[PDB]
Design an enzyme around this catalytic site. Structure first.
Site, PDB file in Angstrom:
ATOM      1  N   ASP A 126       9.370   2.476  -0.527  1.00 33.38           N
ATOM      2  CA  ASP A 126       8.367   3.196   0.237  1.00 33.38           C
ATOM      3  C   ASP A 126       8.686   2.841   1.681  1.00 33.38           C
ATOM      4  OD1 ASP A 126       6.241   4.078   1.733  1.00 33.38           O
ATOM      5  OD2 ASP A 126       4.696   3.185   0.466  1.00 33.38           O
TER       6      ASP A 126
ATOM      7  N   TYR B  25       0.849  -1.187   0.000  1.00 34.29           N
ATOM      8  CA  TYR B  25       0.000   0.000   0.000  1.00 34.29           C
ATOM      9  C   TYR B  25       0.887   1.240   0.000  1.00 34.29           C
ATOM     10  CZ  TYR B  25      -3.578   3.367   1.444  1.00 34.29           C
ATOM     11  OH  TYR B  25      -4.420   4.457   1.471  1.00 34.29           O
TER      12      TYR B  25
ATOM     13  N   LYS C 206       5.264   8.958   8.771  1.00 35.59           N
ATOM     14  CA  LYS C 206       5.051   8.556  10.149  1.00 35.59           C
ATOM     15  C   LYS C 206       6.086   9.056  11.154  1.00 35.59           C
ATOM     16  CE  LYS C 206       2.686   4.459   8.399  1.00 35.59           C
ATOM     17  NZ  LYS C 206       1.293   4.659   8.880  1.00 35.59           N
TER      18      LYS C 206
END
Ligand SMILES: Cc1ncc(COP(=O)(O)O)c(CN)c1O
Ligand SMILES: Cc1ncc(COP(=O)(O)O)c(CN)c1O
Lengths: 427, 427
Positions: free
Chosen positions: A239, A144, A267
């Site tokens: 990623d 994702y 994050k």
């Protein structure tokens, strides 16, 4: 175990927001339903609006690696906000965080801050195509990379948990630009290049997966991808929104020794506030506006509060024994979970690298999204609720990696394994 | 006028980040390229790293409507952060802000929070297509709605103040389902529908433009768009990221009495922190996950700090005389600017509505992006620098609307006009 307050707030929420949540995963639809409403978080714990306390293994989905509301981070923010929360102009703090990221991540020589992992992934996707002049991208099933249109193909995270098909609303033309392949499948990747000579801008992936459950790359997988992308003059993009600063200070690329051309961050770099970033080789980053023709803007990007939080978080991560501690407690947690499953007669597999782990209800092993989907979701749903009742807050999905923090004590781990024994013995 | 500290920090920045900025417009490229580095902001002022003080008319691009670092906002954040900056789960604050937004904005019955105007626009674009089942979207030249690939075609904002294109990297195909027309041109819009029967998901626009300079809709323009979209069963989407809570508590849709089907929000709703949102008719919002199949997510979405800041900002805006005050000082500022231009022999035009204004170095009038592009950019560049030297900080671009705040005093406005006289008399 009372959840009256949560049910009340959630019920009202569903009338105000889609599904009564700001993000799909918070839904609990695959865990039974009945999400718990948080009131506050601190160190390794979270507290319900009902007063229930939990040992948190979600860490707000990755950012809280130093523990929730770390006093030094809070203090840094309080001092900083007195100077204003957003400037809309350059500030010294951006330079500091930029330098720290460049020094920390191998592939990054130049970086651009944004407000989320989604924005970072959107940009990097656009940069990959603008730099190579090719329109096709290769992504893996179960991975994702935010909700940018081209990524909504065989996606993980909330997509997997909810069992929905490639999202609607995205035109046929755009979706055709995304080639997919099974994670850990080098042969499938070569075939994609062979079938699309000169059309692949590059390959993007989670160097270590966290969105279709925890999945580590097989021996030679990352190396292979690096080799073939170079062979066809395509870019290799990591990623590391989840893995960055968690798997190691330099992320997976540093720990496993494979350098991509571009990487996305998120994050942890925000320290608990909305922050994302993308960077890599200088000559590629040169295309980003205003240095280059690729226009990407962000009103709140590089705001002083976010920079402050990110800076303090990374400074704390540079202290002695940080990652060793994460690996120490997480290995014991992961090993304990598996030992307990075996002792209680439940098929299970999993693993961990640093402060990131996974536990599936299937014998496995798990090498890709397909294998992970063999997990007994109904058993997971019972396990999760049972853990909640024992005071343990796990990600509400079988397809989400778990996270530990520097604030988790040996005692916290002990209590977590004790809870796991109680719940699995009754499963 | 010393800018030594700024030049130093900016020079170092260019070696760490693309163009040495986090967002294109900040590099001052269209105005000489010597940006000033901010150290702090308070009330209606901003302070340089060199110690220079400025009366700020950028307000960090819209969020600072109540003034920079408003004491009540700072206090609310300080209290809130003691409970953690991010949960990753539902919290009561989301319900509070959600209700406030629903009650404030006419078209919104259900809302989803995100982390930027870009994310909101990405989502609403996807929702328009998923709801109608059509892939084509109509946008206006000079308008800007984030960098959602499927949008880099006639994009505005910085796209003007830096000779930007259709931001490369976005497949010529992705932006193939996006049709454009001149702002304020109803006939051009009807033609697009006629040439694409059954393919238009809807029309999206800034109800009042701020990204190609300040531009108000002609009489009947918004009404017409509403009429024709209804005629062809297409959606009307208002991008009120800038105008929301600034033009009026209910934004342009409320002030001008035209209700769209969907609207995006940002800036002000975050009170200075990264926050965005999209909402509208309940039946349409029903498609958003986890309530519906259209996927959209965000780790930091609905975080406590963001919600807290948004709630306090909207509460401050509900106090007596808020919008009347903004209109009072901004009308005097705008009128004064034009009066001075005329008295000094320079062709100009502009105007304001609430605390949002524009001032173009062209006789005009300006009804669209083309007209605005007739502005004498070289004169604007000299005007901007001269104002900077007089202690006035204006948006570093001729194609950006200006903003005022509740913290701007009558004295601040007086000093601003005095500065404008000095600068324009010497132009
Ligand atoms: C690997 C990965 N990349 C990007 C994203 C998108 O992140 P964000 O919520 O910050 O948009 C996610 C989801 N957190 C992710 O798991
Ligand atoms: C009308 C409009 N829409 C969307 C955006 C995107 O905002 P953000 O930086 O918050 O993504 C902006 C800011 N340029 C805007 O002015």
């Amino acid at each position: 175990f009372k959840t009256i307050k949560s049910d009340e707030i959630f019920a009202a929420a569903q009338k105000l927001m889609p599904g009564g949540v700001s993000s799909p995963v918070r839904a609990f639809k695959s865990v039974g339903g009945q999400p718990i409403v948080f009131d506050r978080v601190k160190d390794a714990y979270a507290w319900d609006v009902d007063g229930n306390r939990y040992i948190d293994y979600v860490g707000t989905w990755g950012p809280a690696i130093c523990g929730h509301a770390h006093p030094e981070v809070i203090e840094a923010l309080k001092v900083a906000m007195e100077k204003g929360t957003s400037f809309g102009a350059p500030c010294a703090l951006e330079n500091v965080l930029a330098e720290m990221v460049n020094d920390a991540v191998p592939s990054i020589e130049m970086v651009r801050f944004v407000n989320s992992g989604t924005e970072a992934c959107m940009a990097v996707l656009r940069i990959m195509r603008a730099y190579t002049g090719r329109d096709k991208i290769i992504k893996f099933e179960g991975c994702y990379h935010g909700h940018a249109d081209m990524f909504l193909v065989k996606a993980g995270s909330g997509v997997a948990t909810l069992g929905l098909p490639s999202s609607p609303g995205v035109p046929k033309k755009t979706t055709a630009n995304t080639l997919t392949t099974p994670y850990n499948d080098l042969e499938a990747v070569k075939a994609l290049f062979a079938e699309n000579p000169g059309e692949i801008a590059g390959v993007i992936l989670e160097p270590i997966v966290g969105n279709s459950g925890f999945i580590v790359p097989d021996a030679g997988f990352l190396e292979g991808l690096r080799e073939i992308t170079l062979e066809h003059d395509a870019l290799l993009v990591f990623d590391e929104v989840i893995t960055g600063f968690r798997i190691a200070y330099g992320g997976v690329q540093e720990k496993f020794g494979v350098t991509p051309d571009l990487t996305t961050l998120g994050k942890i770099i925000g320290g608990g506030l909305p922050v994302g970033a993308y960077g890599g080789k200088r000559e590629i980053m040169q295309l980003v506006a205003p240095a280059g023709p690729m226009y990407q803007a962000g009103t709140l990007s590089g705001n002083p509060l976010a920079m402050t939080a990110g800076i303090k978080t990374l400074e704390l991560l540079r202290q002695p024994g940080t990652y060793e501690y994460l690996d120490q407690i997480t290995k014991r947690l992961s090993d304990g979970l598996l030992a307990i499953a075996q002792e209680t007669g439940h098929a299970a597999c999993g693993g961990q690298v640093s402060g990131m782990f996974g536990f599936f209800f299937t014998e496995g092993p798990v090498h890709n999204y397909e294998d992970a989907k063999k997990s007994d979701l109904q058993k997971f749903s019972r396990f999760h609720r049972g853990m909640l009742e024992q005071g343990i807050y796990l990600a509400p999905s079988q397809f989400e990696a778990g996270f530990t923090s520097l604030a988790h004590t040996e005692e916290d781990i002990d209590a977590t394994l004790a809870a796991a024994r109680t719940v699995m013995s009754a499963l």
